[PDB]
Design a protein around this ligand. Structure first.
Ligand SMILES: Cc1cc2nc3c(=O)[nH]c(=O)nc-3n(C[C@H](O)[C@H](O)[C@H](O)COP(=O)(O)OP(=O)(O)OC[C@H]3O[C@@H](n4cnc5c(N)ncnc54)[C@H](O)[C@@H]3O)c2cc1C
Ligand SMILES: Cc1nc2c(=O)[nH]c(=O)nc-2n(C[C@H](O)[C@H](O)[C@H](O)CO)c1C
Ligand code: SF4
Length: 500
């Protein structure tokens, strides 16, 4: 007999751990355990989504003739951790070996590495076939290459998969090329019970549970993918970086949550976009861009995470110590852009790429926040957030706390960028055209202060040469007044964070 452990982000009937299962003899284990629901203060909607999808996935496996041992969060006898439930199901089932698909967190991986010793039974940890590249392949692609960039990896993924390839050439001669309501799925009985249970057990957690609309079945997630292809995929590249106060979704797909937990397969999503391309329903730039986000960025981020090692989380290139601002938890800031995106995050457990990078992340970058505080908040607030995908985006891409290890440039931008790409300023109490004075957008002074105080470390970064040139053309008193303006704003933040 076999004990097949399946984690909350492994909700696919093709997950590796299921290869070679004897439906008559083996038992699948799913457990809602407190260790996983509390290692960070997850968004209420995140906990609700995961538990619901784990429950529906349990029912689905039972529906496919699998034997499933489920453990709910408020079940008594619940041992509170993966290992504990592993003990219970062992004693229970006296199985011949444990089978599990490798996880997406160093924390969980390490626990699971402890199984073979803890139980004195052979543990079979299987490589997660949901990723195009294994750890060894990513290591070997990166080995020797004195600079990591997503692009090169992406091209190797394009060749590997055959997506948008005309044999050995990229479709359209080049690898690279840079509204209706979104679907809502009404909570069924299971989901409503979960929502109630979560609100009961995690009432102080970040976020609201009101208007939960997530797909929690494979079918509904496939319906969200289909709705994306039909309604938004055609305009996906045309608005990738735009923000709108009245529209939190725009042409984004909102599929990450399903992809990241096994309700959708990344490769199938790409094939959907490609199929749409050939049938004429989307331009090549939008479909290439879309796919590049999945077999490029997503795959590359996972590779970076496992390559950098667990202490990657400690990266602090600029040696920041400042605590996270209080308004990331409350959204009560006069900065309209930050108030909108944070409020959306509180309400919806979602924000699109450019929001995470250029509003809340950009702010945290310019403000010199302890990178670890930033990683923590990103991992908690979004229902697509797991350390393998969140951490490289935060440490590497947004915060540059790894010093550019993953090839990106510093994404520091002023109120000029945000005014240019959004309509948040239109109703903000701050003036983004003003950099000094009490009405000045905080991002202007903060942008220059960031560049100034980190000048030694960013001196030789070609991308910032124009800004430094401009810095150097300002009178000394202008540079002084800007830095002081920044310091006064940071003061206000540090003061607010003292009440703690
Ligand atoms: C600070 C920060 C934190 C982030 N944290 C996460 C996270 O915890 N989980 C997560 O899945 N994504 C994360 N991203 C990437 C990106 O913001 C989200 O994947 C995207 O907003 C998800 O919504 P969507 O599915 O509508 O994306 P779309 O705009 O529809 O893009 C298509 C798909 O590509 C993938 N994708 C796009 N960009 C990235 C990226 N930078 N890294 C990895 N995959 C990407 C997603 O699977 C996404 O569903 C983060 C980015 C930043 C700057
Ligand atoms: C909140 C939460 N709860 C559970 C759970 O009860 N059971 C489970 O298997 N997984 C959960 N997850 C996902 C995991 O904690 C972890 O992030 C993934 O296993 C990473 O591979 C999360 C994020
Ligand atoms: S003005 Fe500065 S703060 Fe007010 S919204 Fe535009 S950018 Fe955000």
């Amino acid at each position: 007999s076999q004990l097949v452990l399946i984690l909350g982000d492994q909700l696919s009937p093709s997950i590796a751990a299921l290869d070679g299962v004897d439906k008559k003899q083996d038992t699948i284990v799913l457990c809602e355990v407190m260790a996983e629901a509390s290692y960070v203060g997850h968004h209420k909607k995140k906990i609700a989504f995961i538990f619901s999808a784990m429950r529906h996935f349990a029912e689905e496996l039972r529906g496919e003739g699998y034997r499933v041992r489920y453990t709910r969060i408020d079940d008594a006898d619940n041992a509170g951790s993966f290992t504990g439930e592993v003990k219970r199901a062992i004693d229970d089932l006296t199985p011949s070996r444990i089978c599990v698909t490798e996880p997406g967190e160093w924390r969980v991986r390490s626990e699971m590495d402890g199984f073979a010793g803890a139980f004195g039974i052979q543990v079979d940890i299987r490589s997660d076939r949901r990723f195009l590249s294994s750890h060894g392949e990513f290591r070997n692609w990166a080995a020797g290459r004195k600079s990591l960039t997503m692009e090169y990896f992406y091209r190797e993924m394009r060749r590997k998969t055959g997506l948008l390839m005309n044999g050995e050439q990229p479709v359209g001669g080049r690898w690279n090329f840079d509204r209706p309501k979104h679907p809502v799925f009404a909570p069924d009985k299971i989901t409503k019970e979960v929502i109630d249970t979560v609100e009961r057990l995690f009432p102080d957690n970040f976020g609201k549970l009101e208007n939960f609309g997530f797909a929690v079945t494979r079918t509904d997630a496939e319906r969200a993918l289909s709705a994306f292809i039909d309604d938004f995929l055609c305009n996906f590249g045309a608005t990738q970086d735009a923000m709108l106060q009245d529209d939190p979704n725009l042409n984004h797909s909102l599929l990450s949550f399903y992809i990241n937990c096994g309700l959708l397969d990344a490769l199938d999503v790409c094939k959907a976009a490609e199929r749409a391309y050939h049938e004429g329903g989307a331009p090549l730039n939008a479909v290439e861009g879309f796919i590049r986000q999945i077999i490029g960025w997503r795959e590359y981020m996972r590779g970076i995470y496992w390559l950098a090692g667990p202490d990657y989380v400690d990266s602090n290139f600029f040696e920041n110590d400042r605590s996270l601002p209080v308004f990331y938890w409350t959204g009560k800031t006069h900065m309209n852009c930050m108030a909108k995106v944070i409020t959306e995050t509180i309400e919806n457990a979602y924000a699109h790429h450019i929001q995470r990078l250029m509003i809340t992340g950009n702010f945290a970058l310019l403000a010199g926040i302890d990178p670890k505080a930033v990683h923590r908040w990103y991992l908690e607030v979004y229902a697509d957030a797991y350390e393998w995908v969140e951490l490289p985006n935060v440490i590497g891409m947004s915060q540059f706390a790894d010093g550019g290890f993953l090839g990106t440039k510093p994404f520091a931008a002023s109120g000029n960028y945000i005014n240019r790409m959004s309509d948040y300023c239109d109703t903000c109490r701050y003036d983004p055209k003003e950099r000094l004075g009490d009405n000045a957008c905080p991002f202007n002074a903060l942008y220059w202060d960031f560049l100034a105080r980190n000048r030694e470390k960013l001196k030789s970064n070609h991308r910032l040469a124009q800004p430094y040139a401009t810095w150097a053309r300002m009178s000394e008193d202008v540079r002084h007044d800007l830095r002081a303006k920044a310091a006064a704003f940071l003061r206000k933040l540090d003061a607010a964070a003292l009440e703690h």
